[PDB]
Amino acid sequence: YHNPFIVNGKIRFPENTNLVRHVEKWARVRGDKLAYRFLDFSTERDGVERDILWSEFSARNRAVGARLQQVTQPGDRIAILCPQNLDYLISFFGALYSGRIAVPLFDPAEHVGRLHAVLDDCTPSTILTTTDSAEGVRKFIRSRSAKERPRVIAVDAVPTEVASTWQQPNELTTAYLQYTVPSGVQITHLNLPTNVLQVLNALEGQEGDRGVSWLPFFHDMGLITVLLASVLGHSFTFMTPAAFVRRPGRWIRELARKPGETGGTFSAAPNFAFEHAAMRGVPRDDEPPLDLSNVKGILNGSEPVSPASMRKFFKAFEPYGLRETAVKPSYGLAEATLFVSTTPMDEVPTVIHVDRDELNKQRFVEVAADAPNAVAQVSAGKVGVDEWAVIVDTETASELPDGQIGEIWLHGNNLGIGYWGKEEESAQTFRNILKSRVPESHAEGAPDDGLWVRTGDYGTYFKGHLYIAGRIKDLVIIDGRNHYPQDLEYTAQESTKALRVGYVAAFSVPANQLPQKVFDDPHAGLSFDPEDTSEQLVIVGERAAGTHKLEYQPIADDIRAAIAVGHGVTVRDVLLVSAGTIPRTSSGKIGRRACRTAYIDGSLRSTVFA
């Protein structure tokens, strides 16, 4: 493989490098070629193709950019309250073209409050949207104070001719804010082209390849995936998240080889989507032939990878030509722009099993899958070019040996420079020194006195692979002992056919804050004590399809028994709720914190991704 900007395992960018200059290049040399295609399934079930060429795309970007340069101040934040479509990307790029700070968000007409919180946090001067969504955005804004009702610009209403007045706008300055109290990661103009190149390098993307996505643009995985188009001038075809949730086969269809297509396709998705597409994305017998032999890589990340959903997904689409080397477990986060590691392209996913007891003690000890206390661990592959991941003992700020679990710390030009307006949090997360290394350091090549970024994730290196144990703050600590929630959740899943796959939440609540319902239940084994504050294990799970008539107690008993025998901890409460009731993040992950909150205030007992 070869890339001009990569020489001897190092990214070599020309000076004054940013995504804006990259798009302008393709507008000149690949002008008449497809840049982005929006598959619109709003009215037509078959989908309406909305295309824009690199030439057209550049002109729109320069038109919006010029308009922003005329009515905004340098350093202003430009909020993008837009539905998923071409004008969203024109808004995002338009903001970048202007030299101002972009803030990719969502349409208020589709949380409205979360949107208020972010606006409070970064106080944008201007909001970019479409004509059709304009009135709804205005309606949202007038419910805000008069302090500044940020001006609203319908980007599609900005004439292309305005581009003539555009002025070309530094690497270390913030290009945009990536919001995940809300936190906005400051992504610089160097971060953006750096990380997409790291992706392109790991994918080994050829010239005739193309990309497909349904991920929401307001999510880091959704934004960077489609921004990947700017690296090599590849086309990318996208749809809305809603379109995928209702008809997952659309994703599969768009991935499949079109007539005459000799190149390969690339995509990305969270774990739950592999579960969804495996069950509902298989084409019906009355549908046309489906050829997935062109699919090169479908990256699987943003949440713990299920070996079961991975197996089901591959088995389901194998008869249509999907190679076992197509699905790629990957790791990343917003602080690193997006991409940190992925499974090598010529390899099938690596799955191992480790001892649970050792695992809760921050140790990897490999065991057979048949072993009674084995926990599956899916490798996240190799770290990208010119970035580094190390496993660190947070108390000593020192590198740990392979097989021992510590916090993953990161270094590289794709890593952000802070959280917007958060001095203390920024310092703690982004200003760290690696005090000691091991003899065969995974930091080798990184500057000894360079700053490292704390991910908040436990991980380890094992036999050449990076593993993501879990998220530190999501640990379930009971009686001075550690439990990984996805481990508990999997045991709870597999103990019964009554739980919906991927819709179980394990967390702890202090005893005094447990609801009276728990104490009424003799299976709970607890008596109310107003000053007992010890953490108690709670499991919340959605009922599987067609199981609404199944009785509660055998389900709760099975879960409780399995967790007791497998993890040596007692579940105090099992709460079975209807499908879609468990809180979910903006990208579709399970929100354990919101679920925990919703459990305590009793809202639980009484999102696009439905």
Side-chain angles (χ1 to χ4, degrees), residues 508-515 519 532-536 538 596 600:
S508 62
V509 183
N512 50 39
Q513 271 186 291
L514 262 48
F519 302 108
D532 181 18
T533 188
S534 57
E535 294 297 331
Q536 302 303 325
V538 172
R596 180 190 188 265
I600 298 170

Side-chain angles (χ1 to χ4, degrees), residues 549-592:
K549 290 167 72 69
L550 270 51
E551 311 172 277
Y552 166 87
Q553 201 58 51
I555 304 166
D557 289 348
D558 285 334
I559 292 165
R560 181 130 47 208
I563 298 293
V565 71
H567 303 252
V569 62
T570 294
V571 187
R572 296 309 172 176
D573 193 23
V574 175
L575 176 57
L576 302 179
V577 291
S578 314
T581 38
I582 292 184
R584 292 177 70 184
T585 65
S586 55
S587 72
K589 306 182 206 185
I590 299 304
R592 291 192 193 84

Side-chain angles (χ1 to χ4, degrees), residues 142-146 150-177:
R142 313 173 310 225
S143 51
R144 296 176 65 76
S145 51
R151 81 178 72 224
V152 178
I153 299 178
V155 301
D156 52 328
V158 180
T160 301
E161 190 281 331
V162 177
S164 61
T165 61
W166 180 66
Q167 203 75 44
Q168 163 108 55
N170 180 30
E171 264 168 19
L172 307 173
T173 65
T174 301
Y176 70 94
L177 305 184

